[PDB]
Amino acid sequence: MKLNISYPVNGSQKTFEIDDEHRIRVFFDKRIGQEVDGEAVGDEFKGYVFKISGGNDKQGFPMKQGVLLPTRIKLLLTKNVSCYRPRRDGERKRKSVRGAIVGPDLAVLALVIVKKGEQELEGLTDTTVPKRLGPKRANNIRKFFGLSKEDDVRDFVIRREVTKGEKTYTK
């Protein structure tokens, strides 16, 4: 199948195409949120332990947490719940979704690294990505730097420099 994996410490993420039914039978008969060792599926992932966060079956239907039932169903979905974006206030809709349990019916798994092995990955571990923004709240900054109730957040601001042309500015 395919594995969309994420190393959240770096903040990076990468896809991996996979074969070997008898390596992915480890993932078979599992739920979302459980943990799984990595060398069981690939020696490249030796010492790695992964958590599952989601998946998308063939025909496009996602999964949902602790629903049950490795097959598909239809469910009524509303606000403050995944898999449904309401286009009208109070709206609800009966959508098809796939269960939480893992099986061969998936084209994709969504994996996240909770602990690193010993060999490092070129796409996740070596590289790192930035936090594309910084705080905007005063106390958020004050605890970001752990300063005080007095330490001039206006001095501890972060500014981004853009180069529209020859002229640049720190925003």
Partner: protein, 126 residues
């Protein structure tokens, strides 16, 4: 070959063993024995039948396979380079917490400038 699960009792159904009933909702049921089939046709409920997998489940019998999920207690432990931060300079700014006297001197210079600006505004009004 596949192996199957009695729709009533929950039992592995090996080939050439049991039956298969197709109901006019196009729904398929599988039986390992005329016992469970007769009960299905008598339209009983396995949750009330005491020897079926579903009953043992609903009554939590020998079901210690699953135990519990634990709770996570671990900080982020990654000062991410926010990309307007210059993570080295970000650690420098995080370590430069003391020396608020510079902020105080800047505030005093700003106070002097604000007084001068108020005076200039009053003079221009005059």
């Amino acid at each position: 070959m596949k192996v199957e699960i009695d729709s009533f009792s929950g039992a592995k159904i090996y080939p050439g063993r049991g039956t298969l009933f197709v109901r006019g909702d196009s729904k398929i049921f599988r039986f390992q024995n005329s016992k469970s089939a007769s009960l299905f046709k008598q339209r009983k409920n396995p949750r009330r039948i005491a020897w079926t997998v579903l009953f043992r489940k609903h009554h939590k019998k020998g079901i210690t396979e699953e135990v519990a999920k634990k709770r996570s207690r671990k900080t982020v432990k990654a000062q991410r380079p926010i990309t307007g931060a210059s993570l080295d300079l970000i650690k420098e700014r995080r370590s430069l917490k003391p020396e608020v006297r510079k902020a105080q001197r800047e505030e005093k210079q700003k106070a002097d400038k604000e007084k001068k600006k108020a005076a200039k505004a009053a003079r221009k009004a005059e």
